[PDB]
């Protein structure tokens, strides 16, 4: 990043996690939303129009981020995470999504996911004879209460 | 623009802003709307049809314009703008969207966005290994109470 | 040069580079390309054929120039340039394509190749036993943003 | 010209332009093209084959003419024309493509090229050492809205 001209590229997205999500394919659905509000009023006892107040500022939204593990293997890392929550333990954890530069030693952007994050879904891919380009991917859905840069 | 035949081209859209949105990819969802009204009546005690009055003129609509920054970099310009609003300060600002001619010194069209404009969203792109043509774009959503040419 | 009639002939391509390559046979696909755009517009409320705005003026296209080195040798010059690129160590170079004609002292044409000049591909020739007419050539493909006459 | 039977031969292409180019070898792809459109319509409530309206009359197509200059030389004429275009300085030209018969004095055919005449591409030939049959040619590609016989 010697010039203002480059932008971060999909070089090496990776994750800080205590659960061994060691190798991944991709990360998606990541966003930051502040909810707005809208009120319309009539003006102060005179011949002018009403006003629109859109400078009102309600709280911050929460969501979840899709995580795709390349595929099934013999190591049931995500399966146990979901089992602990189904069993009733508040088995949540902090996570860190990292964006990395062309020269990988440079790691400028990180997003902190709240300690209350947890897994609600595990989804299998389709298994069909002869598909060839279908390679048993797994989709993990994690709820993120709060995301901070 | 020596002739009536040319039209403005996508030569150099740029922006007046105190927040350092120095380099951009694009601007979209820009429109000007006056709301209409529709009433139907029966005619004046005679054998003629009713009338439709569509010359009624309610107030002017407000909206937001999508802004796309080429991509993530180490300079967190937009992130802080959204942080200030989430924190509760009415951190709004005036903006100017400029349309430029083939010979760039000629800058004939400008749109003024009200001082109450603010950022409600920051959205990340998808990060997937090997995508290549996916280059970590960021989408910024700004609410514009009033737009004037 | 000595007469008003003569057309330059293939005396020699010659190159400036910060990398010490020594001998080549050729340079292919060098061009200066401006993009065209157009519209059809109806006439001035007269039923006359409209106008074709074919002089709208877009930006300039970018491409790459292919070169062939006389042949494989023990030299590692083209290999290391591509290795820095693949390794993520930005190492672009400034190039100068000079078509020296007749008098090697006289070099009337020199073309600027922006420093972002960057080697992307190295291609080997065919190795066939008994094909006693062939030598092994190397193909180096270099991408560039801007070429100036 | 002297007889009713003879067909014009390739004596010489000749050109009018406001730019002082001097010698060329050829002119390619010159055409006059009207667009066709059609419909199928059923007969006059009689079970007879309908009619093909193939004489509906659309507007006229637009294209460009390619020329080849005898060769590279120290002249900057084609380079500067394209530089004004790329720089955004409208600089179109009026052209006249002339066919001269066995009699160089006799110039029976002259074609108008609307002042739109705008150079879009400049292409270099191949530079290969030892290819002692080749000279370096230049290709100039000029776009035009209208050609009149």
């Amino acid at each position: 990043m010697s010039l203002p001209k480059p932008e971060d590229v999909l070089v090496a997205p990776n994750f800080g996690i205590q659960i061994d999500g060691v190798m991944v394919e991709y990360l998606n659905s990541v966003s930051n939303l502040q909810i707005e509000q809208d009120v319309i009023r009539y003006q102060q006892n005179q011949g002018t129009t009403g006003r629109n107040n859109v400078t009102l500022m309600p709280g911050v939204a929460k969501d979840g981020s899709v995580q795709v593990e390349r595929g099934m293997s013999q190591s049931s890392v995500f399966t146990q995470w979901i089992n602990d929550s189904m069993a009733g333990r508040m088995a949540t954890a902090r996570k860190n999504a990292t964006i990395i530069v062309m020269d990988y030693e440079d790691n400028p952007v990180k997003r902190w996911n709240l300690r209350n994050a947890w897994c609600s879904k595990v989804v299998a891919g389709t298994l069909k004879a002869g598909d060839t380009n279908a390679l048993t991917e797994t989709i993990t859905i994690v709820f993120e209460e709060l995301v901070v840069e | 623009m020596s002739l009536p035949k040319p039209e403005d081209v996508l030569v150099a859209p740029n922006f007046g802003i105190q927040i350092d949105g120095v380099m951009v990819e694009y601007l979209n969802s820009v429109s000007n709307l006056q709301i209409e009204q529709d009433v139907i009546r029966y005619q004046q005690n005679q054998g003629t049809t009713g009338r439709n009055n569509v010359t009624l003129m309610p107030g002017v609509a407000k909206d937001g314009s999508v802004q796309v920054e080429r991509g993530m970099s180490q300079s967190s310009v937009f992130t802080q703008w959204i942080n200030d609003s989430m924190a509760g300060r009415m951190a709004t600002a005036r903006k100017n969207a400029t349309i430029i001619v083939m010979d760039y010194e000629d800058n004939p069209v400008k749109r003024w966005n009200l001082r109450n404009a603010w950022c409600s969203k920051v959205v990340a792109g998808t990060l997937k290994a090997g995508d290549t043509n996916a280059l970590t774009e960021t989408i910024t959503i700004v609410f514009e109470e009033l737009v004037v040419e | 040069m000595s007469l008003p009639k003569p057309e330059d002939v293939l005396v020699a391509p010659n190159f400036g580079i910060q990398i010490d390559g020594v001998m080549v046979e050729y340079l292919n696909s060098v061009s200066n390309l401006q993009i065209e755009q157009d519209v059809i517009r109806y006439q001035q409320n007269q039923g006359t054929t409209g106008r074709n705005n074919v002089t709208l003026m877009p930006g300039v296209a970018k491409d790459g120039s292919v070169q062939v080195e006389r042949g494989m040798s023990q030299s590692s010059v083209f290999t290391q340039w591509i290795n820095d690129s693949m390794a993520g160590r930005m190492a672009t170079a400034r190039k100068n394509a000079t078509i020296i004609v007749m008098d090697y002292e006289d070099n009337p044409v020199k073309r600027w190749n922006l420093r972002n000049a960057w080697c992307s591909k190295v291609v080997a020739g065919t190795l066939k036993a008994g094909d006693t007419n062939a030598l092994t050539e190397t193909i180096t493909i270099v991408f560039e943003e801007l070429v100036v006459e | 010209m002297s007889l009713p039977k003879p067909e014009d031969v390739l004596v010489a292409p000749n050109f009018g332009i406001q730019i002082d180019g001097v010698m060329v070898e050829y002119l390619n792809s010159v055409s006059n093209l009207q667009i066709e459109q059609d419909v199928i319509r059923y007969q006059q409530n009689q079970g007879t084959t309908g009619r093909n309206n193939v004489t509906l009359m659309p507007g006229v197509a637009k294209d460009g003419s390619v020329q080849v200059e005898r060769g590279m030389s120290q002249s900057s004429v084609f380079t500067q024309w394209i530089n004004d275009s790329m720089a955004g300085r409208m600089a179109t030209a009026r052209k006249n493509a002339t066919i001269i018969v066995m009699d160089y004095e006799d110039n029976p055919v002259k074609r108008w090229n609307l002042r739109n005449a705008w150079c879009s591409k400049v292409v270099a030939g191949t530079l290969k050492a030892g290819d002692t049959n080749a000279l370096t040619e230049t290709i100039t590609i000029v776009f035009e809205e209208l050609v009149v016989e």
């Binding site: - | - | 106008r51 | 009018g16 108008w112």
Partner: protein, 371 residues
């Protein structure tokens, strides 16, 4: 047939801003030296001339190009205000060249190009004070018209006498000072306006803003359209309303009127040339021709003809037609096709074998008339 050959025919002695630029002759409160006619905007004009303190008409007619459509205009100063002779028909609003000195006056503008109209706001400024006899006025208006006829590409704005009834203008027009020329036009009623330096009213001639209208008109539509219905922006009122029984007598003799219309405001209505020649009766037609001439003459500007040759004829024919076909494609010309809409000829019959010095003879047809 107006020249279709050259800026000059017998001798080739010869070896932009647009139609909105005009020139005005009169006195300044202060002003620069009077000879170097300058062209500028209100903003700089007032800084050099003065804020109406001299009581001169230029101070007000200048607004014609600033409180109405315009850009810049040329001003000939003549002389300035007395502290705290110029009223003669010889100096100032006169052909006051100075024996090839280009001194203030119609003569001082001979060396200046890019002027479409010339006005003389102070000619009648001293009509009463300077005893400007009728001829003293007539002689100047004749000098102005002659100037315009000689330059060939600009027209004269002629003022009516200061205060008289309809009968009296029918009189000077037909009996004492008719001018009969394709290069001039006159409007009749005087316009009431104010003067902020001291108060609510002053009377001014139907110039200034009246000319501001031409600049406005040319921006709205091609010069072909006449400003036969346009608002005299900046006007307050008129001295007299001229009724239909009077319009019936004045329009046939070339006198243009301005009227207060019941629901439309103060507008220019008449649009005739102060000429006896039927061909040039309409102002917009006379203007269309000056418009085409300025642009075509600048465009095909080659100096010192090399060899009389068909190759030049071909370049010329092609360029003139390319220029004119757009007038046809656009709404300016009449006809179903270029074939009828216009005509260009330049060949050995306009440029015969004698080939003496300048050739370049191009014959052209507009709609009906031929150049």
């Amino acid at each position: 047939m107006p020249s279709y050959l050259s800026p000059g025919v017998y001798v080739e002695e010869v070896a932009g801003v647009g139609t909105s630029v005009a020139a005005f002759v009169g006195l300044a409160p202060t002003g620069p030296l009077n000879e170097p006619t300058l062209v500028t905007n209100w903003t700089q004009y007032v800084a050099a001339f003065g804020d109406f303190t001299g009581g001169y008409y230029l101070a007000h007619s200048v607004y014609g190009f600033f409180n109405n459509g315009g850009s810049a205009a040329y001003v000939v100063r003549v002389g300035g205000s007395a502290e705290d002779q110029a009223e003669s028909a010889h100096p100032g609003p006169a052909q006051y060249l100075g024996d090839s000195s280009d001194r203030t006056g119609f003569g001082g503008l001979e060396a200046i190009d890019e002027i479409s109209m010339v006005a003389v706001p102070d000619l009648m400024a001293a009509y009463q004070r300077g005893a400007i006899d009728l001829e003293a006025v007539k002689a100047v208006q004749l000098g102005l018209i002659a100037h315009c006829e000689l330059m060939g590409d600009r027209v004269a704005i002629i003022d009516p006498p200061p205060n008289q009834n309809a009968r009296q203008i029918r009189v000077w027009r037909q009996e004492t000072a008719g001018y009969d020329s394709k290069y001039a036009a006159l409007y009749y009623p005087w316009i009431k306006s104010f003067d902020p330096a001291t108060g609510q009213s002053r009377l001014v001639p139907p110039s200034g803003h009246v000319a501001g209208i031409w600049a406005r008109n040319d921006s709205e539509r091609g010069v072909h359209k006449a400003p036969a219905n346009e608002v005299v922006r900046g006007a307050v009122d008129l001295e007299l309303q001229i009724t239909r029984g009077e319009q019936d007598l004045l329009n046939p003799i070339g006198v243009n009127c301005i009227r207060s219309f019941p629901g439309r405001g103060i507008r220019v209505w008449g649009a005739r040339t102060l000429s006896s020649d039927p061909a040039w009766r309409y102002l917009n037609i006379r203007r269309y021709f000056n418009y085409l001439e300025e642009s075509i003459l600048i465009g095909t500007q080659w100096v010192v003809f090399e060899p009389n040759d068909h190759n030049l004829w071909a370049r010329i024919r092609r360029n003139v037609s390319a220029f004119l076909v757009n007038e046809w494609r656009n709404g300016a010309l009449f006809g179903q096709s270029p074939d009828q809409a216009y005509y260009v000829k330049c060949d050995e019959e306009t440029n015969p074998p004698e080939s003496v010095d300048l050739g370049r003879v191009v014959c052209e047809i507009g709609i009906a008339p031929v150049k």
